[PDB]
Each structure stands twice: as structure tokens, then as C-alpha cells.
Design a protein around this ligand. Structure first.
Ligand SMILES: [Mg+2]
Ligand SMILES: [Mg+2]
Ligand SMILES: [Mg+2]
Ligand SMILES: [Mg+2]
Lengths: 359, 359
């Protein structure tokens, strides 16, 4: 077949962050390039916060890629289903959905270039721009630096921000949230993210203390595994709950929609099964009339948040867009998806070559 | 410290099965050897069905082992907690709990040798032998071969057997189950395992058709992720449900105890977090007064099933014991745990050396 998979090539880069995020001094980028019989090439990717890169590459090169050679790249859903059961024993999430994601995305890249369509269209096409917020203002920033960075985001042309909470001393979270609300005024959108570092009781107490400052959502108050804990927090608080970048499985988005009482949901195409797996979560989340949001990977998700046109795009702190041929375009406070056929993302291979790592 | 971790060495073996199991022609063995400052050495392991070996080794060697060097091996639970959050982003099960397991088990090996205790004691010591059954009679065996193999198990000194079901034509499952019950007589224990290949409706229909043949449990009727599906099957059937080798997380055993209405539960120390993680599941499962069983890895689990003294040990088809210095000892239909200090398992390194694989 002309669309028969002929070669796959995965690469691992360790790319240094300019700022520490709390602790991360670099992120890992895994690119996967799929070449077809007719010479067509697509590239997908996934990423980590420093751990897993080698492990993902290893699963791709020894477990998955060998099995996919000779398959017909047009059969994306078939290939996705194949991968899910191929590595099931060592799957049901984890490293295995990161690896799946890199391949899937590549197949979708191929398809968009094949059909001359951009991903925001292929993914549902309801819109091509979306709401956007700057996330990941570090927990460990002193107040002054916190407020300054926020000034910087607003000044750069954003109208929405998210800060990290979950300090040992809760009064410090409260005071900071208060501080930020007063800096940004009443017309800026304000989220908080506790990186699943709180107990139900702690979360309930913090939320109840800050709902006066008009918080748009409370992200990952406690462990993402604790759906009933989420329900318990929701039942006792007036701030909508959000997750999750950490759910890796359509079944896990199932649990969350059934039990966790979310106001927002945040599937990450990099680790819940590429565009295929992401669309299943987006479809389910939409069935529940909850806004479809994303985490990380903004250069890719701008297309997918826009396609569904209900939620927010996180402008994440891992600056992957910076190493592409299109850094995130933001017009009038909204992120603008690209009309380039494929997934809308092309890697500046010359730039990242220095960060490639081996064996 | 004399118990300071000084070196870790992980190795990957691809070991050929003599029979096909349905499809597997080999299994993977990952061994992990932890050496302490005072020269003390412990070895733990995990295993797969052919996929993941390289990926596990990669996570161990690039993500986990570097971080553990210099830690105090006596702080097992501390080290376990450390690993769980270290690789959280690419964890919550998957490859990451396999890797965790190999290390943990090694630390427990060290401790038993340090304290001069065998694992069945360290794990609770309620008993040192346990009920045992032969599992994994292949779906694809014709009836005659199926019955013969079962003859062979019984003749070898076992009093309990499990066969695979989940054929496309359900009448073939029914007929086979009937056939096996009639071969073995009324006094042999008989389980069935569908490898999560059925729908709730299918499972409910099959169970209802075979409960006359006195089935002890119905293992993994449908997807392990489908707890409510399990509940629905349980609610409409008289055969106790069992899983799961496929649950990798204490939270997932939580879901199962809360929702799935199991009669038996089957934590696998090789992939739910070593002996540390296994004991948490055993503790929880015991709180619910459900029999603590295991899947696979019989040379190790004989100690842990015995320690809790409620459930069944599966004599799995991956013959790992065969490559140790103590193949499974069975006395009077019961598996006998070893009094050797440590985990009770020592690898015949000379034997498996030929099966080692690299890069
Ligand atoms: Mg977050
Ligand atoms: Mg509420
Ligand atoms: Mg089984
Ligand atoms: Mg019942």
C-alpha cells in the first residue's frame, strides 16, 4: 500500500528549562517519525518532566514500532486499538500511553498532510482559536516575584492566570491568592493548582477561605486517584474542581466524569493516547457538558481545544513551542491554531539537535 | 551506613516457553541486585509476557537506580514512597510499578538475610504452606488435549485446576467446562479464567450456564477497569468473581474492594509494588474478608499467600521457579514456602546466563 508504514524513528531530547519549576530543571521530548511506502512522513511526540524519556523510547523501539511496520497508516483507530492490547500487561496507563501517544499523533500528522487538513478541522472544527491562560507560577516564588511574573503575563497579552498552591502553611496560600486577585483586578480570570498535594479536609478548608476572590477553578486539590475524595471536596465547596493531566486512560476519565464532580477537565494528548485517545476523552467530557480543557503541549492543544470550543488552553511552562517552527500565536488574548495541514507542529530539528541524547 | 545502598545492577533475560500459551512463546525476567556498603546483596525481580522488559530496565537504570544510590536500604517503606512520587508523572501504574517491584523485593531480600528471617514470616507468618492450583490451560487446546493436561496436573499432586475460557462460540466454553468437571470428579477444585475477553452480558450468560458444574471462581470476566461491570455481573450470577493480576495500584485495589463485588482477589507482587505494595493490597483485601490470592511468580508468592493464610497460590505457566535453586515444593497438595532467610528465591545464574539480552 502507498500508506504502508515503512520506517519509524524515535528520538529523545533533554531540553533545559530557563527557570526552575517546583523540582524541574529540564523536560524530556520524545519525537516519533513515521515514514510510509510512498515516502510520506509524519512526526508526533510526547514529553516528560525529566523522568521516563529513556523508558518511553525503549518501549517504542522494542515493543511497539517493530509490530507496526507494514501496517496501513490510514487505519489509525485500528492501530490505536492494536497498541492498547499489545502492551496491555504492562499498560493500562503509565509509560505505555505516552508511547502510544507519540505514534498516534504522527499518524494524525500524516493524515492531515494526506487530506490537506489542519488538526483543528480534523478534530471537529468548531473553532480555530480558544481561551488561554498562563499556568505554573511556582509555589516557591516569594510573593514579590510571584506578583511580578503575573504582571508579565498580563502585559504579554493574556487575560487569565493560574498559580500553584499547596504550601505547608495554608495561610501563605490564602495570603498569596488574595494578593494576586488584588494585583490583577476583578476582570482577570484566576485559577489555582495544588498539584494533588492536599488532603480532602485541607482542600475543603483552603477553598472555603478563598472563594471570595472569585477563583475560576481549583486544579488537582488532592490525589487524582481519589475520585470520591474529589466528590467530597466538591460537595463542601463553591469552587469548581479540575483535573486531569494525570489521567491516562479513557476508563479513568470515565471514573472522573462519574464520581469526581468536576467543573473542568484537562486531557493531555501527550499521555492519554495521542489525538485518538484525546478525542475519546473530549467526546466523553463533552457528553457531560463540562468544558474541554488541556494541560501542557500548547502548540498542539491549541488545535484541539479550538476544535471543541468549550474550554481553556494552558500555556504550559515547558516551552515546547519554542523549539518548533511556530511558537504559540496569541491574538487578542486567544491562542490561534495554524492552518498548516497536519497537526500544526514542526520541530526546528537544527535547534534541538544539540539536546539529543543516546543509548 | 553499613546498609547504605552502594550499587544496583539490573538484568534482562528472554526465556523461551516450552509450550505456547494463548500468544506467548517466551516470558521476560528482570532481575535487580542491590549491594550495600557492608557488602550485603539482595536480588529482587519482576517479569513480563514478552513486552516491556527493555522499558522496565530503562526506567530502572536511568530514572530510579541513580536516585537510590546512597539511601539506607533499611528504610524500605520510605524508599517505596520515594519511588512512587519520583516517577508519578509517568506512573500511577504501568511500567513504573514493575520497576518499583523489582527494587522493593530486593530490599526485602536484604532484610530477611539481615534479620535471619524467611519471607513467609516477615510477611505475617500465619502459615508456611498454602492451597495451590494449576492455572493457564490454554484456550486454544482441543478438548482431548485439554483433558489430558488436566489429568497431568492432578496426577502430579495437585487438587485444584483453572482453565481459560472466552471463546467466540460460548457453547464451546460451556461444553469444555462440563467436560472438565466430569473428568475430575466432584472433589477437585475448578476455576475459570476469561482473560477479560467478555462483555458483562456475555459473562452473565456464561456464568449462569455453568454454575451447575460447581465453579470456585470466575476470573476476569470482563475488563479489569470495569468495576461497575463486575458489580453488574456479580449481581446477576452465583459464581464468585476474581481479579486481579492487572491492578497495579493500591487505589485500584481500593476501587475493586469498593465496587467490583469480588469473592477472591489476586495481587501480583511483581507489578503492584513489590512486597511492600503487595502487603498493602493484602492488608486491604483482608479488611474486606476476601481470600488473599496471587497470580504468577509462584516461587515468591508461596511465601505471601502462606503468610496471610486465606487464599490460593496460582502455579503459573511462566516457569520462573525452574530457573531458581528451589523449584516449587508441593507436599500433600499444598505449596511449601522455604525457611531460607530472605525472599526464598535464588536464581540459577548459570542456567539463565544464556538467555540474557542487551542494549
Ligand atoms: Mg496542573
Ligand atoms: Mg461544589
Ligand atoms: Mg489470569
Ligand atoms: Mg453474585
Amino acid at each position: 500500500m502507498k500508506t504502508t508504514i515503512k520506517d519509524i524513528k524515535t528520538r529523545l531530547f533533554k531540553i533545559p528549562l530557563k527557570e526552575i519549576l517546583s523540582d524541574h530543571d529540564h523536560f524530556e521530548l520524545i519525537t516519533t517519525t513515521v515514514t510510509l511506502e510512498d515516502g510520506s512522513q509524519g512526526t508526533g511526540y510526547t514529553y516528560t518532566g525529566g523522568k521516563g524519556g529513556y523508558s518511553i523510547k525503549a518501549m517504542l523501539e522494542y515493543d511497539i514500532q517493530p509490530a507496526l511496520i507494514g501496517k496501513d497508516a490510514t487505519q489509525i483507530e485500528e492501530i490505536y486499538d492494536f497498541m492498547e492490547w499489545h502492551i496491555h500487561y504492562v499498560g493500562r496507563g503509565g509509560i505505555s500511553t505516552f508511547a502510544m501517544s507519540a505514534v498516534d499523533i504522527a499518524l494524525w500528522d500524516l493524515k492531515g498532510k494526506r487530506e490537506g487538513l489542519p488538526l483543528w478541522k480534523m478534530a471537529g472544527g468548531k473553532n480555530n482559536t480558544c481561551k488561554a491562560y498562563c499556568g505554573g507560577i511556582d509555589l516557591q516564588f516569594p510573593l514579590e516575584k510571584l506578583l511580578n511574573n503575573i504582571c508579565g503575563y498580563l502585559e504579554s497579552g493574556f487575560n487569565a492566570v493560574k498559580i500553584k498552591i499547596g504550601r505547608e502553611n495554608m495561610q501563605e496560600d490564602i495570603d498569596r491568592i488574595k494578593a494576586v486577585r488584588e494585583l490583577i483586578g476583578p476582570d482577570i480570570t484566576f485559577m489555582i493548582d495544588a498539584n494533588y498535594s492536599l488532603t480532602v479536609e485541607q482542600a475543603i478548608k483552603l477553598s472555603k477561605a478563598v472563594e471570595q476572590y472569585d477563583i475560576t477553578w481549583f486544579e488537582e486539590p488532592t490525589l487524582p486517584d481519589d475520585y470520591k475524595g474529589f466528590a467530597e471536596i466538591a460537595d463542601n465547596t463553591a469552587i469548581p474542581l479540575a483535573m486531569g493531566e494525570n489521567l491516562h486512560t479513557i476508563h479513568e476519565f470515565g471514573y472522573a466524569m462519574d464520581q469526581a464532580k468536576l467543573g473542568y477537565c484537562q486531557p493531555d494528548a501527550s499521555n492519554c493516547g495521542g489525538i485518538t485517545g484525546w478525542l475519546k476523552a473530549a467526546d466523553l467530557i463533552t457528553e457531560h457538558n463540562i468544558p474541554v480543557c488541556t494541560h501542557g503541549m500548547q502548540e498542539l492543544h491549541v488545535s484541539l481545544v479550538s476544535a471543541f470550543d468549550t474550554g481553556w488552553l494552558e500555556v504550559h511552562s515547558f516551552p515546547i513551542d519554542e523549539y518548533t517552527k511556530r511558537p504559540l500565536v496569541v491574538e487578542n488574548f486567544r491562542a490561534v491554531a495554524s492552518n498548516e495541514p497536519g497537526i500544526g507542529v514542526e520541530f526546528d530539528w537544527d535547534k534541538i539537535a544539540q539536546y539529543e541524547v543516546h543509548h
